[PDB]
Design an enzyme around this catalytic site. Structure first.
Site, short mmCIF file in Angstrom:
data_model
loop_
_atom_site.label_atom_id
_atom_site.label_comp_id
_atom_site.label_asym_id
_atom_site.label_seq_id
_atom_site.Cartn_x
_atom_site.Cartn_y
_atom_site.Cartn_z
N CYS A 399 0.66 -1.22 -0.08
CA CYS A 399 0.15 -0.08 -0.03
C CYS A 399 0.81 1.40 0.25
O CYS A 399 0.22 2.20 -0.20
CB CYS A 399 -0.95 -0.03 1.42
SG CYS A 399 -1.99 1.38 1.45
N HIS A 526 -4.49 -4.13 1.80
CA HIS A 526 -3.75 -4.67 2.91
C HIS A 526 -4.04 -6.18 2.95
O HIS A 526 -5.22 -6.59 3.52
CB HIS A 526 -3.96 -3.94 4.53
CG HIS A 526 -3.64 -2.53 4.18
ND1 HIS A 526 -4.18 -1.71 3.74
CD2 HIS A 526 -2.75 -1.88 5.00
CE1 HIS A 526 -3.61 -0.31 3.95
NE2 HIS A 526 -2.78 -0.42 4.73
N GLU A 528 -2.78 -8.14 4.94
CA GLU A 528 -2.38 -8.63 6.30
C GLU A 528 -3.54 -8.82 7.36
O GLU A 528 -3.65 -9.38 8.37
CB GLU A 528 -1.58 -7.54 6.93
CG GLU A 528 -2.00 -6.27 6.88
CD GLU A 528 -1.10 -5.27 6.95
OE1 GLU A 528 -0.99 -4.50 8.09
OE2 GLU A 528 -0.29 -4.90 6.07
#
Ligand SMILES: O=P(O)(O)Oc1cc[n+]([C@@H]2O[C@H](COP(=O)(O)OP(=O)(O)OP(=O)(O)O)[C@@H](O)[C@H]2O)c(O)n1
Ligand SMILES: O=P(O)(O)Oc1cc[n+]([C@@H]2O[C@H](COP(=O)(O)OP(=O)(O)OP(=O)(O)O)[C@@H](O)[C@H]2O)c(O)n1
Ligand SMILES: O=P(O)(O)Oc1cc[n+]([C@@H]2O[C@H](COP(=O)(O)OP(=O)(O)OP(=O)(O)O)[C@@H](O)[C@H]2O)c(O)n1
Ligand SMILES: Nc1nc2c(ncn2[C@@H]2O[C@H](COP(=O)(O)OP(=O)(O)OP(=O)(O)O)[C@@H](O)[C@H]2O)c(=O)[nH]1
Ligand SMILES: Nc1nc2c(ncn2[C@@H]2O[C@H](COP(=O)(O)OP(=O)(O)OP(=O)(O)O)[C@@H](O)[C@H]2O)c(=O)[nH]1
Ligand SMILES: Nc1nc2c(ncn2[C@@H]2O[C@H](COP(=O)(O)OP(=O)(O)OP(=O)(O)O)[C@@H](O)[C@H]2O)c(=O)[nH]1
Ligand SMILES: Nc1ncnc2c1ncn2[C@@H]1O[C@H](COP(=O)(O)OP(=O)(O)O)[C@@H](O)[C@H]1O
Ligand SMILES: Nc1ncnc2c1ncn2[C@@H]1O[C@H](COP(=O)(O)OP(=O)(O)O)[C@@H](O)[C@H]1O
Ligand SMILES: Nc1ncnc2c1ncn2[C@@H]1O[C@H](COP(=O)(O)OP(=O)(O)O)[C@@H](O)[C@H]1O
Ligand SMILES: [Mg+2]
Ligand SMILES: [Mg+2]
Ligand SMILES: [Mg+2]
Ligand SMILES: [Mg+2]
Ligand SMILES: [Mg+2]
Ligand SMILES: [Mg+2]
Ligand SMILES: [Mg+2]
Ligand SMILES: [Mg+2]
Ligand SMILES: [Mg+2]
Lengths: 556, 556, 556
Positions: A399, A526, A528
């Site tokens: 990002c 993202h 994650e």
């Protein structure tokens, strides 16, 4: 309905979220549906205006709400999907109450903290606790985590609220756990109990009484300290759980089962659990905690960021990598590199630091560039991508490593020396990174591309698509304000840069790939946020595999 | 009169006494007479009934008052002699007030905490601050140290008292310093400031405002933490002194001079110090702190005790040894051995510990046996003396190593297998250690042989007398309840045991010596109480010298 | 064992003792044995050093302990005999704990408020609650009254103690009642509830929760105020008892029965009372309260004292008179006269006051002279006795009207102009009132002739002996330090003064009588302490009768 309130003692960062998640997973392993709520007494409708230094790495839900990482821990541990109403704050409460008063819902009456703010809090908790969270399941227990420390000026309403709640919901449906720090100063020479005593005193000075006291220490404490706590805080010795610092948090629930928390909660809340059945309940966590101790392969990853002085500013990221390295049967060795030391200004002020950080960067096996904001530490984040490009080192960007990589590619291949960001220089000739004017209203706060959006890969097999299972689509969480310029797209596409992904309308870039390079993947979103212990995220998986030269083998 | 109040924050053991002593020595180096007072909010007329685990190694004054070690630090730093009235407690205050009320000194009035207890406190402080302490010098500044943590239930009177005192003595004669802990938990990953904030809030909730904030940490803190403290606690950045953990406490005053405490105190209290004069004021402490860093000789001493899990239970002892090793130009390496592991019961339950501790004991250069009470750990303290006797290893014994050594000598030379203590077995045939019935009234508390008594050496040159400067007398502080049996004296004297010292009436033994042995000295008194940085204590001096084989050379 | 704790709110003097006595008599009417304890947080071992201005008219028990009048109310309502241990104070607690610590009963431990002071309090309460008080009856309920207001600095220990006690004795044996003032300021124009709210908040800030709230007001309050209290203090509307100001306190228990306190206490403490039985339980109090409203005869009595600005400085006295006038079927009209206005110094500074008070004195039917101390207002107390003597007006004197009367008789009959007191002038030629040197040790406090002593009347029928039932003896409570000179006895006995009573050894005068005079009786003791509603005291009985010219008729 049953409620477990988790309060805090001496400091924030003491471990309330891990304890709450552990309670949740224990109860869920014995056949109970659990939901979770987080109360944050700060005056903010969401954590979207915070620095990572403040409270550690804003987390994003599917709906698009910026929240504390404790909700990330809940999601990872219990496998749930939470919403914007699972995060209560003082700002929201006061806004709602002020609106109701300006409407005339208490006409004739003076609006005060008691009863109105506390009532609102209780109504919100009641409402959200009954709401299904993993489908249409009917929740039977709610874990509420009260943020901050007991005694803070901001959290006095909430405490009061719950002092009433415990009589509204019949003590036999309400239990309280107080997590307190037990420090051991080097020069003092003994574990100290006075802060916990004072925190419990402050708690009892608000009408609440602990049913459990969880003592947090770096090392285990003896029975003498336990006895002191039990006597000077007026709970039973069986009600003092000592959770010390562990290698992984997977060990926390086990350590709780080892101390009889399940039996106490079944006796105190009357859960009616059949225990001849419950054995082998935590086999998942046992396997995970063990495998986290049997892996000896030492894959070494570099994280080049600008918040590296506070590691919790990348919590999700870190955990993601772990979830990958453990599924590949490897041991992770994380290196944190500060970006400003990769810049040439440090070579004329502190060359030793410069050369040491460059050594750390060059003697690793894979590079991860995380996201960020502002302009402090991006011109070294550029050089990291440039080096990994000109030296064939695997790389994942998140990002802002995407934008850094695009700018680097421009300035090093297309001879665009001024390729830069609008966030740094908005008056630049060649603006590779531009502003999305739909999210630039001046009103910062909620004004971000947020939440789960849909992915569509361009046609043409892609390693990153094969890691995703070769689907046509995938939903992923976004949090950003800028975007790569679509105009310069083909000027990079007529070279070793390839956009293997974008939105449904095919004009907002969200992935990029470098041909010939082993692994140079970048995502504007993202990835994650959806990684789980037993369900890693494909980009990190591929990063690790490339870092151990097992990517092509795993592909086939 | 000027007053500096030193308060505490998060924990006890945070370092208030060292800070107070440092203020004292700074002011005294610039030409000011200083006195000190210690307030201990516990309900005890003195610390003679405490374990060393409670508050670290009872200290004894000349008059015979048992007090906290902070007064020992005052004496060592400022070279003063303090009295029983320099230690105020809640017990004393309440006893005095209750007596006055039962006399009729407030007839007609209701006796309450306010005004009467607070008045008593202020009158006591006023009285003692004007009292000369290093002769008939007129004190110009008093350092008052308030024990415990702000917020304790026991110290609310005192706080209130001082809130009045600051208006009774005209703010420009009163200054307050708050010592607070700044922890850095390993898993949290940052120095935490919230406990200091809460302590300052609790302090301000009692009418007092800090003029200085001393932040105590293991490592130094950055300017960001300092700024946070200054902003959230409402003092100036120049008023935040950060004292981290240091190798020696001699560095503390210097670190204060380095932060401008002298100038601030001269501006705030209007001391009118001429500073073109004051340079080279702390040359003593500079020399000491340096010499403590330049010594590389590694003399290794063993301390065999029963409180070895909390090192501060031997503070004085330790410091004594240091003051010796630095004057001999040696570096001390202290080994703490638990006595119970030298006993054979551990050889049948945990042999590894037994053999490890015996290894530690045998690979040293000198043995120090400290004092104690009770029966837990004396039968290994016996074996230590026995080994040092049968292996020619220097040895110093302090008030219970003397009795242990006498019993050992009896049981190993005179074939007196049952030679024992009354404190262990009072119904023993051969009682080498008996009870002094003048101090066995049942009323424990003040019922001890206490304070400075006179020494007289028997005729016949003695190494321990040559170390004392070959005088006829010396005053030394005692604290004990038992005494070696005078009857068996000659039965040991007709062997390698010799009583080179006793009282003025020649029937109470207080020293003993072993002929042929290099150094086997024992003292029933405590020579640790009068040792100073630039005036070591002769017994420890000789112990060190014997431990480096430099005793005979130093004698000549 | 069952416990009812009675706490206070906004002010002292709010009515806790009356409420406690009412609970006691309610429970005792339904067949339960009750004991009572009074906790006074002031630092005084007893109230013998107080002025009557401080806490209203010291009361004396049989054992001789000076205490608060609440114990007098307990005795009058429940017909019990209490002891020195039924009155706990902070002074006693701290003295006891300090003694135990100086003995060595907590050797090794630091003595603090928690746990030690609170433990002592709980042990004392446990001990005294089980002690029989009306024989060897086994008490089943204890009413503990905590003096002062919640929030006072002196009563924080006690509160804490009870917060533990409620869990030590199993909530179903413990109940709390909070008595709070509800003021109605004239200019504000409404009954105010905020002080009660704040008091309940302060109470809950110490771990205690009210089971009953008793609201005290001058007039009755509406249901709106009750609802406000119930909502903002979080108890049920059935748990809000409103006790307003009444004509007699006999109405208080009835008003409680009228509000369902018996049923609530039987349901909350599980007393297992059979209620078809309990009707007509309070017939005694009903008869008394009624008869107190049906009497129209208006006997007017004068009380000449020196504390007349605070009427509660004569509580017992007043009540005594009432108990008499109601048994004679008369209505009492009490006049309070300040003694200093009967003196000639006021005739030269404020003649209107002088003549007005003398008018009040001369237009009454009987005179009562109470006790006192010091020298302020005795030279008018002399003139009152002189006037009643030279004008044939009934008179009763109590422990200082006796001495005043003796001095008056001397100076007006025997021509002894200097007849005076030692308390005024100790160097007087003719000392009619002298010092008892057994009670003049300088140590004021407990150093008084105190408690019940035996009476013996001299031979020769006496009206005051006929009022006592013509016995040979009677026990009566004393509280005094001086005594009439036995030497001058016969010099007054050879005139219209006659000593009809003295001690068992016949040398300490305690009664005197004037022949020819209708009623001129004086007692050195206090007959006010043993008067009861249904058992008046003979001296006051005779005073009233003489004041209505019914004494000779009642004699026959
Ligand atoms: O040392 P000073 O100079 O400050 O002098 C001190 C230190 C401590 N105290 C008092 O002793 C009790 C326990 O103290 P304490 O802090 O140790 O609490 P605790 O229960 O033992 O918990 P913890 O493990 O944290 O120690 C408290 O009543 C303190 O007010 C006093 O009077 N002077
Ligand atoms: O993490 P959670 O789960 O507890 O969630 C948390 C943690 C903290 N807070 C609030 O933020 C402010 C500062 O917090 P904070 O503890 O960090 O104090 P500070 O000034 O920064 O000093 P310090 O250095 O010790 O940190 C306070 O108003 C807190 O009540 C909230 O609302 N939720
Ligand atoms: O008049 P001002 O000038 O002081 O201005 C005032 C008076 C009162 N208030 C607020 O209204 C609430 C109830 O007030 P309140 O005192 O009346 O308590 P309550 O519950 O009604 O009990 P109570 O019967 O004693 O009145 C409280 O939150 C007050 O803080 C404000 O804001 N300004
Ligand atoms: N009734 C009414 N009150 C309003 C309105 N707008 C503002 N108010 C205020 O809100 C208050 C309502 O409180 P109430 O206790 O119900 O008093 P009330 O309006 O006179 O109603 P009643 O007590 O039944 O007469 C009024 O006193 C007004 O001051 C409105 O539109 N209608
Ligand atoms: N005067 C006096 N009071 C005593 C004595 N012993 C106990 N007391 C108590 O202490 C109180 C003294 O308080 P004061 O305010 O001086 O009242 P007083 O004693 O009547 O003195 P005046 O107010 O001047 O009349 C008395 O009311 C007694 O209750 C004593 O020996 N003499
Ligand atoms: N044992 C003992 N202690 C005393 C005596 N007088 C004062 N003390 C103090 O009270 C403390 C007792 O506390 P403990 O925790 O029992 O320590 P101890 O006396 O060494 O006893 P152990 O821990 O069993 O060895 C001692 O440390 C002394 O400082 C005494 O006569 N005997
Ligand atoms: N028992 C533990 N051992 C090791 N680390 C822990 C433990 N408990 C918590 N942590 C870590 O400490 C940090 C703070 O925990 P967190 O749940 O955020 O607490 P809080 O909600 O109080 O701030 C996180 O990085 C968490 O993983
Ligand atoms: N700056 C410091 N560095 C290292 N040790 C220190 C420092 N300050 C204090 N200490 C040590 O810490 C212990 C506690 O200090 P002390 O003066 O007893 O504090 P307090 O009066 O708060 O208990 C002592 O052993 C002292 O020598
Ligand atoms: N309900 C009541 N009506 C009238 N007088 C009352 C009432 N309750 C108490 N009193 C009187 O008020 C005074 C104070 O009461 P007391 O029991 O001494 O209260 P406390 O223990 O709070 O000081 C006494 O004179 C008592 O008789
Ligand atoms: Mg946190
Ligand atoms: Mg913070
Ligand atoms: Mg910025
Ligand atoms: Mg200490
Ligand atoms: Mg301690
Ligand atoms: Mg012991
Ligand atoms: Mg009263
Ligand atoms: Mg008063
Ligand atoms: Mg007086």
């Amino acid at each position: 309905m049953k409620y477990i309130l988790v309060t805090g003692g001496v400091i924030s960062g003491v471990g309330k979220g891990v304890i709450a998640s552990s309670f949740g997973t224990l109860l869920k392993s014995c056949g109970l549906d659990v939901t979770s709520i987080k109360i944050d007494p700060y005056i903010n409708i969401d954590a979207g205006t915070f620095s990572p230094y403040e409270h550690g790495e804003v987390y994003v839900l599917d709906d698009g709400a910026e929240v504390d990482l404790d909700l990330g821990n809940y999601e990872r541990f219990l496998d749930v999907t939470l919403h914007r109403d699972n995060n209560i704050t003082t700002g929201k409460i006061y806004k709602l109450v002020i609106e109701k008063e300006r409407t005339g819902e208490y006409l004739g009456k003076t609006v005060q903290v008691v009863p109105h703010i506390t009532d609102a809090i209780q109504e919100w908790v009641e409402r959200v606790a009954q709401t299904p969270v993993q489908g249409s399941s009917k929740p039977q227990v709610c874990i509420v985590e009260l943020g901050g420390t007991i005694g803070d000026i901001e959290g006095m309403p909430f405490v009061e609220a719950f002092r009433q709640f415990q009589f509204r919901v019949k003590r036999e449906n309400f239990c309280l756990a107080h997590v307190s720090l037990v420090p051991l100063p080097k020069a003092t020479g003994e574990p100290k109990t006075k802060p916990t005593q004072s925190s419990v005193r402050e708690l009892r000075g608000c009408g609440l009484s602990p049913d459990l006291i969880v003592c947090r220490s770096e090392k285990p404490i003896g029975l003498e300290v336990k006895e002191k706590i039990s006597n000077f805080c007026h709970v039973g010795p069986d009600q003092v759980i000592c959770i010390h610092d562990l290698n992984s948090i997977y060990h926390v629930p086990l350590l709780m089962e080892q101390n009889g928390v399940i039996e106490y909660l079944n006796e105190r809340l009357q859960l009616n659990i059949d225990m001849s059945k419950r054995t082998k309940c935590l086999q998942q966590w046992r396997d995970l905690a063990r495998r986290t101790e049997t892996v000896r392969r030492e894959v070494c990853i570099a994280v080049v960021g600008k918040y590296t002085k506070f590691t919790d500013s990348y919590a999700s990221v870190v955990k993601a990598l772990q979830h990958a390295a453990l599924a590949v049967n490897r041991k992770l060795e994380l290196v944190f590199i500060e970006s400003c030391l990769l810049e040439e200004e440090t070579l004329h002020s502190e060359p030793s630091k410069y050369h040491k950080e460059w050594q750390k960067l060059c003697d690793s096996h894979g590079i991860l560039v995380p996201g960020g904001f502002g302009s402090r530490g991006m011109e070294g984040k550029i050089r990291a991508c440039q080096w990994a490009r000109e030296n064939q080192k695997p790389l994942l960007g998140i990002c802002l490593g995407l934008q850094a990589a695009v700018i680097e590619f421009a300035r090093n291949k297309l001879g665009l020396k001024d390729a830069n960001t609008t966030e740094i220089d908005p008056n630049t000739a060649n603006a590779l990174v531009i502003d999305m004017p739909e999210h630039h209203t001046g009103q910062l706060g909620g004004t971000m591309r947020l939440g789960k959006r849909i992915t569509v890969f361009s046609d043409g097999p892609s390693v990153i698509r094969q890691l995703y299972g070769n689907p046509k689509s995938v939903q992923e969480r976004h949090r950003h304000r800028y975007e790569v310029n679509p105009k310069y797209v083909h000027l990079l596409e007529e070279q070793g840069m390839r956009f293997v992904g974008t939105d449904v309308d095919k004009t907002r870039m969200e992935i990029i790939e470098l041909s010939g390079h082993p692994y140079f993947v970048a995502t504007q979103y993202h990835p994650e946020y959806l990684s789980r212990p037993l369900k890693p995220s494909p980009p990190f998986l591929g990063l690790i595999l490339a870092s151990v030269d097992r990517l092509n083998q795993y592909i086939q």
